[PDB]
Write an enzyme that holds these catalytic residues in place. Structure first.
Site, PDB file in Angstrom:
ATOM      1  N   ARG A 177      26.638   9.353 -18.433  1.00  0.00           N
ATOM      2  CA  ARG A 177      25.407  10.071 -18.102  1.00  0.00           C
ATOM      3  C   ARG A 177      25.140  11.230 -19.088  1.00  0.00           C
ATOM      4  O   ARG A 177      26.083  11.924 -19.512  1.00  0.00           O
ATOM      5  CB  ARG A 177      25.446  10.581 -16.650  1.00  0.00           C
TER       6      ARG A 177
ATOM      7  N   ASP B 243      15.434  -1.490 -15.632  1.00  0.00           N
ATOM      8  CA  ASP B 243      14.171  -0.894 -15.174  1.00  0.00           C
ATOM      9  C   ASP B 243      12.915  -1.614 -15.668  1.00  0.00           C
ATOM     10  O   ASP B 243      12.044  -1.969 -14.877  1.00  0.00           O
ATOM     11  CB  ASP B 243      14.128   0.554 -15.733  1.00  0.00           C
ATOM     12  CG  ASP B 243      13.648   1.649 -14.817  1.00  0.00           C
ATOM     13  OD1 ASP B 243      12.964   1.328 -13.814  1.00  0.00           O
ATOM     14  OD2 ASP B 243      13.929   2.843 -15.118  1.00  0.00           O
TER      15      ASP B 243
ATOM     16  N   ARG C 214      14.613   2.608 -10.688  1.00  0.00           N
ATOM     17  CA  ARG C 214      14.136   3.938 -10.322  1.00  0.00           C
ATOM     18  C   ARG C 214      12.732   4.325 -10.799  1.00  0.00           C
ATOM     19  O   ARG C 214      11.989   4.943 -10.031  1.00  0.00           O
ATOM     20  CB  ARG C 214      15.175   5.002 -10.727  1.00  0.00           C
TER      21      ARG C 214
ATOM     22  N   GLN D  66      22.957  -5.787  -9.488  1.00  0.00           N
ATOM     23  CA  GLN D  66      21.859  -5.860 -10.447  1.00  0.00           C
ATOM     24  C   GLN D  66      22.178  -5.355 -11.872  1.00  0.00           C
ATOM     25  O   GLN D  66      21.309  -5.471 -12.744  1.00  0.00           O
ATOM     26  CB  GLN D  66      20.635  -5.095  -9.887  1.00  0.00           C
ATOM     27  CG  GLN D  66      19.539  -5.969  -9.289  1.00  0.00           C
ATOM     28  CD  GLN D  66      18.411  -5.121  -8.785  1.00  0.00           C
ATOM     29  OE1 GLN D  66      18.362  -4.744  -7.610  1.00  0.00           O
ATOM     30  NE2 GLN D  66      17.486  -4.791  -9.666  1.00  0.00           N
TER      31      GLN D  66
ATOM     32  N   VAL E  70      12.151 -29.510 -21.064  1.00  0.00           N
ATOM     33  CA  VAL E  70      13.348 -28.815 -21.503  1.00  0.00           C
ATOM     34  C   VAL E  70      13.362 -28.690 -23.027  1.00  0.00           C
ATOM     35  O   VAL E  70      13.763 -27.653 -23.541  1.00  0.00           O
ATOM     36  CB  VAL E  70      14.528 -29.627 -20.921  1.00  0.00           C
ATOM     37  CG1 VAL E  70      15.653 -29.862 -21.919  1.00  0.00           C
ATOM     38  CG2 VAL E  70      15.028 -29.024 -19.612  1.00  0.00           C
TER      39      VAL E  70
ATOM     40  N   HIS F 152      21.894 -34.523 -18.262  1.00  0.00           N
ATOM     41  CA  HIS F 152      20.850 -34.366 -17.236  1.00  0.00           C
ATOM     42  C   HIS F 152      20.986 -33.147 -16.335  1.00  0.00           C
ATOM     43  O   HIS F 152      20.048 -32.830 -15.607  1.00  0.00           O
ATOM     44  CB  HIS F 152      20.610 -35.671 -16.461  1.00  0.00           C
ATOM     45  CG  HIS F 152      19.910 -36.692 -17.289  1.00  0.00           C
ATOM     46  ND1 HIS F 152      20.615 -37.590 -18.069  1.00  0.00           N
ATOM     47  CD2 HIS F 152      18.584 -36.887 -17.477  1.00  0.00           C
ATOM     48  CE1 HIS F 152      19.697 -38.319 -18.686  1.00  0.00           C
ATOM     49  NE2 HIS F 152      18.460 -37.938 -18.351  1.00  0.00           N
TER      50      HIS F 152
END
EC number: 2.7.1.11
Lengths: 323, 49, 99, 725, 323, 50, 50
Positions: free
Chosen positions: D35, D105, D149, D239, D472, D604
């Site tokens: 941080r 984010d 956030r 996440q 594909v 496949h």
């Protein structure tokens, strides 16, 4: 103009950048552009002594008309695919360049010719930097005001016969551009060894199935890799030369490479077979193993026949394939 | 008329050295006479996870 | 459920799927008690949750509903019950067994 | 992070070419993160500067979010301030700083997407997919508390990707007064129309128009008082972890190479950039502007001016929000058109299966039904139509669970109308189809062309028709993206991660065979994202010299290794000689039996179980655009004309001898612009007519270049270095 | 912009120029560019009193909605080939231009229409000088920024229905341009008689087999040449009007051609037969003999049905043909 | 024009004596537009043609 | 495949082997039937064209 900055940046003397200012073709004039630029090169750089010497020190050979004399008009003008395997370490960059233009002029005397393809390879770092100088030179020489590019072949007409030419300049600047998909940042090392194998990588991926009918050989800088005999040897293996391909070897200096070379080209089949074998036995190491020389080893069964020899300059033609 | 849920045949590589996944599937197509087809699925020795 | 439907069919007996669990059992009828075929439980291996469905039956907690459920089984001709559920879900089935 | 730059000593360590082995399947960071705290103070930034000069550091690359880049921007502004107590000054006088956006984010301005955003989105989808994968119950509700956030992008995209009822985003917050009552409305409306899987998505920064936060517990309570058994699912740190998705692997690798280039290509005249992505093109935006623009969105929200904030978001965000809002409001009946203007729309699946087929068909059916049109699904392609007249009408309820499901619910196959035009034309006339959507690959492209050409012979085919490219291979002309391709790349990267792990007395080298048709796109992309040594493609020649070179690289690579396991990517259609099987066989005999070579054939399985979020989002964008095109009134018969029922079906009438179009009023009955390929070019959706595309395409199932995928991959594997010594 | 210079040359008042300069539309608003021009027109020219009096002096008829009055939404929206046969003398140049715009808007209230073709004839000197100003207005009203010209149709999308239109202004300037083959020099006199016949020469040459379904008649200048009834008789003669055409005839001032028009149209077959013959006996002279009124005498054998009347504003419809 | 007319016992009246065609006769060919002929044959569901 | 099936047959009962004479089928010298007919037909060819 951009070339003039590139040149100053590559420690090259301003003379070159200065020539590209005084360099201009008259076009409308009776004299063909190639010959105009050619005579302009002699003046600016004073290539009169060095040319004379290059003849003198080679038993007064006609270093101005090596092709013209040996061959008849048909023979010289039938040659369509030419590989110039570097620049001599015995001549200045302006003499080397001049000679390119001079050899070019020689094959374009006739108006009854099919197109000409000329490949110049600038292999070491010494000459490599002058690619763009040579490209702006060949552009003015041919007069590509038909339809210069960062990469690519220069197409135009050339010589006394206005014979359509397509001049190709293979160097590391073009090779880097290729590898990085034309990215701005092309600043990375590339060994002369890598360069030889990438030229091939291009011949096989471009598809080219045309045969060289005149092979120009000399003494280039970086002989560990750019070894005359080793280049011939390679072209022999890859089936790249015409069945009656002419091999011209010019230079002033006589060394062991030239002895090794001449003894191979002019050697009996048994001599050539052993020449190859003993090189592999003596020179192949498990670390050396991968090098192109260990793969594209030459062919003893290709016969040559001497055509011309004026002390240090010679012409041999392939005369047969024993099988 | 029924639900179309799909069809599988699982063949351990060691079940037959001759009748292999690929051979088996070609026989199915031959015998199927255009009424349906057969395709192989060979993931490999990645099954470890 | 796929297994019960097929196994029971193979062993030669009619399989009924009681939709909404005890609620379906207490309410009864064709609405909640449907006869299930072999091809009706196709590819249920991959399916998540319960295709039959579950429901919390307030009535079955009392003798009021437990009796109604008993009638519905005899009316549907169901000779046997298979419960797939939790603790109380099976304790309630156990109480239904003694009652 | 910055802590190591401030206490820079043993915290500054060199990285070797081998140190970054297998990092493309790892995440988060091996360098470690921290941080922004001591770098918030000037004396901290001063020390960070000293350490750079002292350790001879001339360039800095900052990979972080909004906060980290605001710091990088402030460090560059404050750098010309060098206090003295030395040649060091003149040397390190000009800071060379480049920024990469490492953010889940997707808040950063100037870039269409940030590194980690799609991967984080995948984690959300992973979880909501489990919630959805249960057989529906009578009165159930689910709340998903999603992270992010500063930006509503994750919330929004999750909304589209999962078919959420309601979403909470900071950019468009609801009234404090009636958000609960609007939530109730929306949910019960869908529940009325058949929905039994009520899903709400609450963003980390979710608020009301009075800046008050909206907790998932608040939302749960609302749905519970509507008689629904509600369950909160908080994603949390899930996440931010796991291997990056296919796109992120590409995005970080490509931007990472450019970051190094941007450092070299620098001078004090050229400003400090942020490596960004715009129309699928890597761009160098200025750090100064990007941090400034991003602060103005935060300011707008804080200032309760949510209009400025939403307007301040890229078209990507805008178009996505508009799409979510559209689909949500299809139940309104506001989309409903007059009885005369209602049409019979046909949907057909032409080609091999892709997971993207059902989500695309879902959005197309809902869009059409919302207007009062009748939706008819041609079951089992053209063969199903020809052989059995296999048409099935679709309703709001039929669409249920399709946004999640792979393959085809109606059936997909490569049969062509060619098989029997007459029969296709008979059926089109019977069911009176006024529009057609052919979802599929090169055969869907082929069918569109064939039917367009048949307009001459069969008047009934002179209807608006479109091909929605789904494959594909990414081999359909008229688009840069085909639905199902991102799912495939994700399936492949994951598959190869398991390959390299099983390659750690079993196996060493793996030849993974990629089935991407006659185009090297799939293989090339897959190669970049899996860190493959060599990639075999039809575009690049395979021979004894090329093979020897590939063996040399593998040989030179293995004689340095001390996490290992190498891969080669072989495109199924690259050489009829040097096949996956022959290449693997040559590797094995190489080095007198040095390494154990193995083949792998995902095959496949490349279609995937569930469509990716990129596939879900695009399937929805394009399905919407398909319906808007075919159902456009401009291409439809005019109702205020003396037209017979047959004249309106034939789409032409004879007026005073002259054969006139019942649509254009023009003498030329057939419009070539009505048979179009709906694809993506950059970011924009394009409508391209088949006739023109059909002369352009090659007999090698289709000019297009993805060269830089191969260039970057070769730079990052040993290839480019071995190729140059 | 050239138009302003042109109007100063034709002796026209500055008002018209000033209108064009401040005339601007924005297809970024719900109001269609046609209603937008209409608004700007009613403003700059103060046409409110003139419109009010136009109605109040035609027994208070809704002049602002005559088509919307008689026809229903379908009835009006089917009409696709209009012919406005001159401007009314009783209306000021801007009042007429508004009436052309008010008519166009009525025929384009639906988004389910087949395209409209609107023809406007400017049959005399008092209106022909205004043609480019009209053509510029229609251009803005329709918004032909889709893909102006000194000649040709103005294509575009008009009304709330946003209907595709193709407006045609058939005037003398245009006819001269056609005749000279677009040569710069067009200053030569053109008779109002000569003009009508050249309009017929354009049609007969173009080969247009599309029938007039709305026919707009009025009190034009050169009552001797642009006689409302004489114009009817010529179209009746040439099979140019649809089987069920609509004839809308308006004016404030009442004249004898108005008496004779209504007596012809409303006349029994025996009457019309006699009407024609007695015009020919009375007016045919060997000096007059070649005039189009003696060629295209009209058709007695036709039938009309009086559909609407409110003081000098009438709508009749071709009810039948007796063969 | 899609000019199909259904015939009944009463429609046939006086036709054994009358010349020409009561339905109309001309040398136009289905070639003119097969698709349109085929559309109409399908609509009216013709099971035979004279 | 046929040879492979024979081999696995009888739980590995017999040893199956493939033989492919192939391009050797043309032979070193033509047979007498071939020599005699080549002569008959060559004669008949010439007699026809000439």
């Amino acid at each position: 103009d951009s070339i003039i900055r590139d040149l100053e940046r590559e420690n090259v003397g301003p003379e070159f950048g200065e020539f590209l200012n005084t360099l201009q073709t008259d076009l409308n004039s009776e004299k063909p552009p190639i010959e105009q630029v050619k005579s302009q090169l002699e003046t600016h750089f004073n290539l009169a002594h060095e040319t004379q010497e290059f003849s003198r020190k080679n038993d007064n050979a006609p270093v101005d008309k090596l092709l013209t004399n040996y061959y008849n008009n048909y023979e010289v003008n039938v040659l369509e695919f030419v590989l110039q395997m570097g620049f001599s370490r015995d001549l200045s960059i302006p003499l080397n360049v001049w000679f390119v233009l001079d050899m070019i002029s020689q094959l374009s005397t006739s108006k009854q010719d099919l197109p000409l393809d000329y490949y110049l390879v600038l292999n070491n770092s010494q000459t490599g930097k002058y690619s763009d100088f040579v490209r702006y030179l060949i552009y003015e020489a041919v007069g590509a005001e038909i339809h210069l590019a960062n990469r690519g072949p220069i197409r135009g007409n050339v010589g006394a016969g206005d014979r359509k030419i397509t001049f190709h300049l293979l160097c590391k600047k073009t090779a880097r551009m290729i590898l990085v998909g034309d990215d701005r940042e092309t600043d990375f090392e590339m060994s002369d060894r890598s360069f030889v194998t990438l030229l091939l990588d291009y011949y096989q991926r471009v598809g080219t199935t045309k045969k060289i009918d005149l092979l120009l050989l000399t003494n280039n800088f970086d002989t560990n890799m750019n070894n005359k005999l080793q280049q011939l040897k390679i072209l022999e293996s890859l089936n790249m030369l015409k069945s009656n391909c002419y091999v011209l070897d010019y230079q002033i200096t006589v060394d062991q490479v030239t002895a090794n070379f001449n003894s191979y080209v002019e050697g009996i089949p048994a001599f050539r077979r052993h020449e190859i074998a003993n090189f592999l036995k003596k020179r192949k190491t498990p670390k050396n193993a991968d090098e192109l020389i260990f793969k594209y080893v030459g062919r003893w069964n290709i016969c040559y026949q001497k055509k011309f020899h004026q002390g240090n300059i010679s012409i041999h033609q392939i005369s047969g394939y024993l099988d | 008329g029924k639900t179309k849920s799909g069809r599988l045949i699982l063949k351990s590589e060691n079940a037959s050295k001759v009748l292999t996944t690929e051979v088996i599937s070609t026989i199915i197509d031959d015998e199927a006479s255009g009424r349906f087809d057969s395709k192989t699925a060979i993931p490999g020795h990645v099954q470890q996870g | 459920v796929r297994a019960v439907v097929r196994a029971g069919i193979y062993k030669g007996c009619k399989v009924f799927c009681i939709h909404e669990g005890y609620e379906g059992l207490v309410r009864g009828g064709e609405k909640y008690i449907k006869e299930t075929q072999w091809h009706d439980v196709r590819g249920w291996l991959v399916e998540g949750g319960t295709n039959i469905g579950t429901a919390r039956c307030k009535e079955f907690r009392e003798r009021s509903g437990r009796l109604k459920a008993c009638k519905n089984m005899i009316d549907m001709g169901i000779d046997a019950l298979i419960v797939c559920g939790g603790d109380g879900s099976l304790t309630g089935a156990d109480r239904f067994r003694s009652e | 992070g910055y802590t190591g730059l401030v206490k820079g000593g043993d915290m500054l360590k060199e990285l070797q070419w081998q140190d970054v082995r297998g990092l493309l399947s790892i995440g988060g960071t091996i360098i470690g993160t921290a941080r922004c705290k001591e770098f918030r103070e000037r004396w901290g930034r001063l020390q960070a500067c000293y350490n750079m000069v002292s350790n001879g550091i001339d360039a800095l690359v900052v990979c972080g979010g909004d906060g980290s880049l605001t710091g990088a921007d402030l460090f560059r502004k404050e750098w010309p301030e060098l206090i003295k107590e030395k040649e060091q000054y003149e040397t390190h006088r000009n800071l060379t700083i480049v920024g990469l956006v490492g953010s889940i984010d997707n808040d950063m301005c100037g870039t269409d997407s940030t590194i980690g955003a799609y991967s984080s989105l995948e984690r959300i989808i992973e979880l909501v997919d489990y919630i959805d994968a249960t057989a529906a119950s009578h009165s159930r509700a689910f709340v998903v508390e999603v992270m992010g956030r500063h930006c509503g992008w994750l919330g929004l995209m999750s909304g589209i990707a999962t078919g959420a009822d309601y979403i909470f985003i900071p950019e468009r917050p609801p009234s404090e007064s009636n958000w609960k009552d609007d939530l109730k409305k929306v949910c019960l409306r869908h529940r009325e129309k058949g929905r039994r899987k009520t899903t709400v998505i609450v963003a980390e920064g979710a608020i009301d128009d009075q800046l008050n936060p909206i907790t998932s517990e608040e939302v749960k309570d609302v749905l519970v008082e509507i008689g629904l058994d509600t369950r909160i699912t908080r994603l949390g740190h899930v996440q931010r972890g796991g291997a990056p998705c296919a796109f992120d692997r590409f995005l970080a690798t490509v931007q990472g190479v450019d970051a190094v280039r941007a450092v070299l290509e620098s001078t004090p005249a050229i400003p400090s950039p942020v490596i960004s992505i715009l129309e699928n093109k890597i761009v160098r935006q200025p750090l100064v502007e990007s941090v400034a623009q991003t602060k103005t969105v935060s300011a707008a929200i804080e200032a309760k001016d949510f209009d400025k904030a939403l307007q301040l978001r890229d078209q990507e965000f805008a178009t996505s929000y508009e799409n979510f809002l559209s689909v949500s409001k299809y139940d309104d009946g506001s989309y409903l058109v007059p009885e005369s203007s209602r049409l019979n729309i046909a949907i057909i699946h032409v080609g091999a299966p892709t997971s993207a087929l059902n989500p695309a068909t879902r959005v197309a059916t809902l869009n059409s039904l919302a207007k009062g049109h009748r939706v008819f699904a041609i079951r089992n392609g053209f063969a199903g139509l020809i052989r059995h007249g296999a048409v099935r009408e679709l309703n709001w309820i039929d669409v249920e669970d399709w946004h999640n499901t792979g393959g085809s619910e109606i059936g997909t196959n490569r049969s062509l109308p060619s098989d029997d035009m007459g029969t296709v034309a008979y059926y089109f006339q019977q069911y009176k189809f006024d529009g057609l959507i052919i979802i599929g690959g090169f055969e869907a492209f082929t069918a569109l062309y064939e039917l367009d050409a048949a307009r001459a012979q069969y008047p009934i085919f002179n209807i608006p028709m479109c091909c929605l490219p789904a494959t594909v291979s990414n081999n359909v002309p008229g688009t840069e993206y085909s639905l199902g391709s991102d799912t495939c790349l994700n399936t492949l990267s994951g598959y190869c991660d398991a390959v390299k792990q099983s390659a750690s007395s079993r196996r060493r080298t793996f030849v993974v065979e990629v089935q991407g048709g006659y185009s090297g796109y799939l293989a090339s992309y897959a190669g970049l994202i899996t860190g493959a040594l060599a990639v075999y493609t039809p575009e690049n020649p395979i021979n004894l010299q090329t093979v020897q070179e590939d063996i040399e690289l593998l040989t030179r690579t293995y004689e340095e290794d001390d996490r290992s396991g190498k891969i080669f990517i072989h495109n199924e259609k690259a050489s009829k000689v040097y096949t996956t099987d022959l290449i693997a066989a040559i590797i094995g005999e190489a080095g007198k039996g040095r390494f154990e070579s193995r083949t792998a054939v995902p095959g496949h399985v490349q279609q995937g179980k569930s469509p990716s979020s990129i596939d879900r989002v695009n399937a929805c964008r394009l399905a919407i655009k398909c319906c808007n095109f075919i159902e456009d009134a401009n291409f439809q018969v005019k109702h205020n004309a003396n037209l017979s029922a047959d004249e309106r079906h034939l789409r032409f009438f004879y007026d005073d001898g002259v054969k006139t179009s019942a649509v254009s009023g023009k003498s030329s009955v057939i419009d070539d612009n009505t048979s179009v390929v709906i694809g993506i070019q950059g970011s924009e959706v394009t409508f391209t007519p088949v006739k023109q595309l059909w002369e352009n395409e090659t007999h090698h199932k289709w000019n297009v270049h993805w060269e830089q995928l191969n260039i970057v991959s070769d730079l990052l594997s040993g290839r480019l270095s071995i190729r140059t010594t």
